[PDB]
């Protein structure tokens, strides 16, 4: 029942009785969808006008100053990007698209009101506007050769919000929020007086605003309190409040008051605030299209506030999802573009002031400098923008879906506590509550749920199924958060009689958004899926319901930190969410059209597509694999093809898995037999014990790639040389170094070995007389140059997979450098030309097959089109400035070195289970020592039972029993296939193994005998089982599976100690306990330091291990030392150890000498503090007191 090539190769058992009403929506849709609306217009969507085009149209007309010049926008043209994303990243250039717009200017006599501009400037031209960054189909941005992801931002929606502080009774408040600009506020008072403020200022009556414009007793109390006599007086008072100590002006105040709230550019609602305000007052008379504030709107807001004080109405909830909206990265890009456009418009108005030309074209006035800088500044320095995590494919999906309220317009980390961190009732359908940072940012990540979707207004919506006449309809609809509160929704778990009618009279459902017991008749909707509430990352964990929420959150955060192994192993127990996660992430290749593989090699895939069952196409497509691609986490990424020659394939099938993917399924862990008994105190707490077979079998070995860059710069004294000709260096050390001075590719480098050699000149050596005598005795000259070669840090071992060199610009290349560059270009073009010919040769063979079928004009230009791309590829390599980059002026040359070193799990490493149980390996034991079953198979890992009782992670025990059942099922299949390997009996054995339990009915009959033999070989290690997160198989089904395996109906089994061979009293549960390794190696954490460089300002040691590191001494540690009374330890550590320059040298000499002496005259930091005080008028000095 696999129905797919990936499914056909291995068949995974499935569980649960819930039908799949709707398939999961695309995970990356939210990131991809926002960019398209900004850069594209769809008639069906109704997005006729692109946002960028609308922004250009709004500010295009200027009419500077009666110059007979008119600026009109005609059209926008987008230039093709110079380099593809793969080429841009290798070069380090940022993927970008040129933006061009058409401006028409009309000129004429420019007389006083006659024929000013109707007879001139009939000529118009396209003017370059700037460079716009482009988004890949994966929705990621490459900047400076670095991939980046912009997190979505959640911000309070523009509108009118009424809230009352409880400090005083009747203290209601009215707030109006604009999309941009200042927002006015109204505050009630204990006396019942009304006050109006703008953002911040002196308190004043709200009546002043009405005076400027032109059962209620509140107006009477407020009117008498204010002494304002006329609107002019009120306007002068408002101007004085806005600026203090500034004289009022007759026309100055009028322009300022209208400008603050009556300027369209200055103040706009964005069409969201106006829509909310009209709905809140329910008035259609005010124009919805105009986003500017109106006198009627302000009077209505004041009326609503008075009505709330009367007691008719309800206060709004800020925490409510409907009030909060999510802002896409493209909207931020649009805002930056608008700011740049405003600056450009101001420049154009100023630019017209100087004219020195005849029939001047409208190209000189346009300036593109302002727009490019703002967008680049936002992308490079954007707080929301950050490097995407490369640890695993799941991590990349988690980061893109993440929405952060933090950033501009966002609450500060310490500002908001105990309010936004909680989960609202509306959060169930929009944001998964089990996933959040355990750090202070906890409760702000608000990771988006898998089924969560974004409406055009930016409000998240959740799919639901309507119910008619007590009968559930199959129609699926999306409900807004505000709409959802009124309706009552029943959970999908509720059973049906097959007529879509609820059997139970009383069911648990949310009518007010809070779970309650209600009759089936009142229910109006049903949940589309059980896992809809949980996030996509949460669904991966099996037996989620059995696990505690805190432990589940800890496990979910830990799984994303998992590090990929050399061989991917599919988990025996899986929710089945892994296959969707792998397909959605672009780490695997999917065939565009149905075709039969023509040639397969581990560098590219060639496929031929049949036109009869497919739309018209070239008939040949080529897919290029990526081998050992470097990652931000320094994790090797490579793609291996699962396709075979002459293998039928269909669109959407995975030709080959790429990163952390096995057979189209994401695997971050290896299955190991696990026992649950305390051993010798090796795991007293969270410690984990490893048999060592995994270390020997390379079960947990990972490959890390390290890039080292050496650059050459021109100093004032001289230009530094990377040539490997350094005095005082032996030939054997330089023997690995090539004649060019760059280490040979593929050559193992010991720690501290020279990767590149550089010499920098020195002057005014001023050698001391003893040094002079030494030079005279040996006739030794003093070098005027010093060597600063690049060497790998100690404790690091690797081989050089790739070497990159960039030459100088504007300088003719040397024969070795110039010849090397030409040779590299020819090899890339020559390999491409032969490779391009190979594709051309395959097309020619296909034509020969179709020679009877007419190819004379059918593919005449097909070869020509391929030739143009090859020429462009040759041009692109020579299209560079000659250094492959600008290089930054003052940089002579740069070199890039890539080293890949394998890593194997060792003691002190950290392993975290999917259930959230985590441990650090304490020791490695011999295979004989590890406990074994009566069969004698060893137990790879032993776990502590006490920890499971303390934390309710009951899911892990159930998974271990399920894993044991899967292990038992595999052994029976191995016994059946060990002898008499015939398809007919194997089919019966497979029917018993899969159809014995469950209603899945895999229908293995469809698979041919040849497929059956491969499937049996694949299942030898284990039989895959898929469990729904809330639809997991019950204990009875697992017990039946254990019986089929022939194991007793319990997890525990008899075991014998290896050392004495005597069985332990009491049986011990054995489970697969699938495990993953977190990215926390102990190799980089050792941080051993004895003597290190000191901070220049404080003469104190550097920290963090960046250079020599060292451990800072805490103030609390000083308190503990004072409690101990060890003054000698405290005094010595503070002076000689840290800032005593005289003491440190003396201490080092004494330690080398071995003689005992102590000098602690003073600490340098105290002297620096006295100097800082001395600069101020206050004077601090040491003194002697005889009094």
């Amino acid at each position: 029942m696999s129905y797919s090539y990936a499914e056909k190769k291995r068949i995974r058992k499935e569980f649960g009785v819930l039908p799949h009403i709707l398939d999961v929506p695309y995970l990356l849709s939210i990131q991809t969808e926002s960019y398209k609306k900004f850069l594209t217009v769809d008639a069906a969507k109704g997005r006729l006008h692109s946002g960028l085009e609308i922004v250009l149209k709004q500010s295009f007309p200027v009419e500077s100053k009666n110059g007979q010049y008119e600026l009109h926008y005609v059209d926008y043209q987008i230039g093709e990007p110079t380099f593809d994303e793969t080429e841009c990243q290798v070069r380090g250039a940022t993927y970008d698209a040129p933006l061009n717009v058409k401006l028409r200017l009309v000129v004429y006599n420019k007389d006083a009101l006659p024929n000013e501009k109707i007879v001139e400037d009939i000529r118009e031209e396209y003017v370059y506007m700037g460079d716009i960054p482009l988004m890949t189909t994966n929705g990621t941005f490459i900047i400076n050769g670095t991939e980046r992801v912009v997190v979505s931002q959640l911000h309070r929606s523009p509108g009118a919000f009424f809230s009352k502080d409880d400090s005083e009774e009747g203290a209601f408040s009215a707030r109006i929020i604009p999309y941009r600009g200042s927002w006015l506020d109204f505050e009630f008072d204990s006396k019942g007086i009304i006050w109006a403020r703008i953002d911040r200022k002196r308190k004043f009556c709200a009546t002043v605003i009405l005076k400027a414009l032109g059962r209620g007793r509140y107006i009477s109390d407020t009117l008498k309190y204010d002494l304002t006599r006329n609107t002019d007086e009120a306007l002068v008072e408002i101007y004085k409040v806005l600026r203090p100590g500034d004289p009022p002006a007759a026309a100055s105040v009028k322009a300022l008051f209208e400008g603050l709230f009556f300027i369209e550019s200055r103040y706009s609602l964005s069409d969201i605030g106006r829509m909310k305000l009209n709905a809140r007052l329910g008035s259609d008379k005010v124009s919805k299209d105009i986003y500017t504030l109106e006198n009627s709107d302000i009077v209505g807001v004041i009326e609503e506030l008075i009505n709330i004080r009367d007691g008719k109405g309800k206060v709004d909830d800020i925490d409510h999802l409907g009030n909060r909206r999510v802002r896409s990265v493209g909207e931020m890009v649009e805002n930056q573009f608008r700011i740049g456009l405003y600056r450009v418009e101001k420049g154009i108005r100023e630019s017209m002031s100087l004219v020195h030309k005849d029939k001047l074209m409208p190209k000189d006035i346009v300036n593109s400098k302002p727009i490019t800088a703002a967008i680049k500044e936002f992308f490079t320095s954007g707080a929301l923008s950050q490097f995407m995590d490369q640890d695993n494919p799941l991590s990349e999906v988690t980061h893109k879906r993440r929405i952060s309220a933090l950033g501009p317009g966002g609450l500060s980390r310490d500002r908001a506590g105990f309010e936004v961190r909680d989960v609202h009732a509306t959060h169930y359908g929009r944001l998964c509550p089990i996933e959040t940072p355990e750090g202070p940012n906890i409760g702000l990540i608000n990771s988006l749920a898998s089924y969560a979707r974004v409406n055009d207004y930016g409000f998240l919506e959740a799919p639901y199924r309507k119910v008619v006449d007590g009968k559930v309809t199959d129609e699926i609809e999306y409900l807004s958060a505000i709409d959802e509160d009124n309706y009552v929704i029943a959970q999908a778990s509720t059973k049906l009689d097959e007529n879509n009618h609820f059997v139970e009279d009383i069911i648990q459902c949310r009518s007010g958004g809070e779970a309650i017991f209600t009759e089936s008749s009142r229910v109006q909707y049903m949940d589309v899926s059980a896992k809809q509430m949980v996030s996509a990352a949460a669904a991966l964990i099996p037996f989620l319901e059995h696990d505690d929420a805190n432990r589940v959150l800890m496990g979910a955060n830990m799984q994303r930190q998992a590090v990929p192994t050399l061989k991917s192993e599919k988990p025996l127990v899986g929710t089945g969410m892994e296959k969707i996660v792998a397909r959605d992430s672009g780490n695997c290749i999917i065939a565009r059209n149905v075709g039969e593989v023509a040639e397969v090699d581990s560098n590219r895939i060639v496929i031929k597509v049949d036109t009869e069952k497919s739309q018209t196409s070239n008939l040949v497509d080529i897919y290029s694999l990526t081998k050992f691609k470097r990652s931000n986490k320094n994790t090797c990424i490579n793609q291996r093809p699962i396709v075979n020659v002459g293998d039928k394939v269909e669109a959407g099938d995975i030709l080959a898995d790429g990163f952390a993917t096995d057979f189209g399924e994401l695997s971050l862990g290896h299955n190991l037999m696990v026992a649950f008994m305390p051993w010798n105190g090796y795991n007293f707490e969270d410690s984990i014990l490893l048999s060592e077979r995994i270390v020997k079998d390379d079960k947990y070995t990972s490959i890390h790639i390290e890039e080292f860059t050496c650059v050459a710069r021109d100093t004032k004294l001289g230009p530094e040389e990377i040539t490997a000709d350094i005095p005082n260096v032996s030939e054997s050390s330089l023997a690995k170094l090539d004649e060019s001075g760059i280490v040979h590719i593929g050559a193992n480098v010991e720690a501290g070995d020279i990767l590149v050699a550089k010499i920098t000149p020195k002057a005014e050596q001023q050698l001391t007389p003893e040094e002079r005598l030494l030079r005279a005795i040996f006739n030794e000259k003093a070098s005027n140059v010093v060597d600063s070669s690049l060497r790998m840090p100690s404790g690091t071992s690797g081989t050089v997979i790739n070497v990159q060199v960039f030459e100088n610009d504007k300088g003719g290349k040397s024969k070795r450098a110039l010849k090397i560059e030409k040779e590299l270009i020819d090899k890339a073009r020559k390999d491409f030309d032969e490779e391009f010919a190979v594709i051309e040769s395959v097309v020619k063979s296909s034509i020969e097959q179709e020679v009877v079928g007419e190819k004379v004009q059918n593919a005449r230009e097909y070869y020509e089109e391929a030739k143009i791309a090859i020429d462009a590829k040759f041009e692109a390599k020579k299209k560079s400035i000659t250094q492959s980059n600008e290089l930054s002026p003052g940089v002579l040359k740069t070199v890039k070195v890539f080293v890949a070193i394998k890593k194997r799990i060792q003691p002190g490493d950290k392993m975290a289970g999917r259930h959230g149980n985590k441990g650090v390996v304490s020791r490695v034991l011999p295979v004989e020592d590890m406990p074994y079953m009566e069969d004698g198979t060893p137990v790879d890992v032993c776990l502590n039972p006490l920890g499971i009782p303390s934390r309710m992670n009951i899911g892990q025990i159930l998974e271990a029993h399920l894993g044991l059942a899967s292990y038992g099922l595999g052994k029976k299949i191995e016994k059946t296939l060990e002898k008499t390997r015939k398809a007919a009996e194997l089919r019966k054995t497979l029917e018993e193994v899969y159809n014995s339990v469950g209603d899945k009915k895999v229908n293995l009959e469809a698979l041919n005998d040849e497929e059956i033999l491969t499937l049996c070989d694949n299942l030898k290690g284990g039989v895959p089982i898929a469990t729904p997160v809330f639809d997991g198989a019950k204990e009875e089904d697992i017990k039946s599976l254990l019986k089929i395996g022939g194991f007793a109906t319990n997890g525990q089994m008899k075991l014998f100690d290896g050392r004495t061979g005597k069985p332990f009293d009491r049986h011990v549960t054995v489970g697969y306990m699938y495990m993953l390794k977190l990215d926390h190696l102990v190799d980089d954490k050792m941080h051993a330091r004895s003597t290190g460089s000191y901070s220049l300002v404080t003469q104190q040691p550097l920290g963090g291990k960046a250079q020599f590191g060292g451990q800072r001494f805490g103030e609390m540690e000083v308190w503990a030392l004072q409690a101990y009374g060890a003054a000698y330890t405290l005094r010595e550590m503070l002076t000689v150890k840290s800032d005593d320059i005289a003491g440190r040298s003396k201490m080092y000499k004494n330690i080398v000498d071995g003689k005992l002496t102590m000098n602690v005259d003073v600490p340098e930091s105290f002297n620096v503090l006295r100097n800082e005080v001395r600069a101020l008028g206050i004077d601090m000095d040491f003194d002697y007191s005889s009094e």
């Binding site: 050399l566 061989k567 040639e599 397969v600 090699d601 581990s602 560098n603 081998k627 050992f628 090797c636 490579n638 291996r640 093809p641 020659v645 060592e692 270390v695 020997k696 390379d698 490959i703 040979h744 590719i745 593929g746 050559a747 193992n748 081989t799 997979i801 890949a900 194997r904 490695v924 011999p926 009566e934 069969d935 004698g936 198979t937 061979g1061």
Partner: protein, 162 residues
Amino acid sequence: ASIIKVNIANVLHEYSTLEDVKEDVVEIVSNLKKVAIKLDTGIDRLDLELSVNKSGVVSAGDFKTTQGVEIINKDQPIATLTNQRAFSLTATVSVGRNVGILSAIPTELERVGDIAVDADFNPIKRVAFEVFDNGDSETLEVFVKTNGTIEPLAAVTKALEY
């Protein structure tokens, strides 16, 4: 005795891709490690040369039948070739025992192409023993699972001698 060193005809490092080969160089090394070898008592160390021009799938049996060298895993395939090509490599075989991961010498490499390969010397996959009493005497039953490189009775005698 297991292979400790393998040199490819055209490779500079383990992380490289040969033309028209589905398997990766690291994947080829992994296939090589699982290979089981039986050696003569006095051989101690020997070098094996494999050269094939087959357009099909390369195999351990493809290894040249030199004297002394014995390959138990004929079925295991070293690599698969998509298109016809010339493939050759040299693997060094020496007698060894597992002294633990910490106490392991990396092994010197003289040729630039030489690649270090870890080897599992021990051949006994599983050992099981049981005791039956006949009355005034007992009979010891031991179940031994091996790659088949060494006959079980000889291995039992060697263990008792040690």
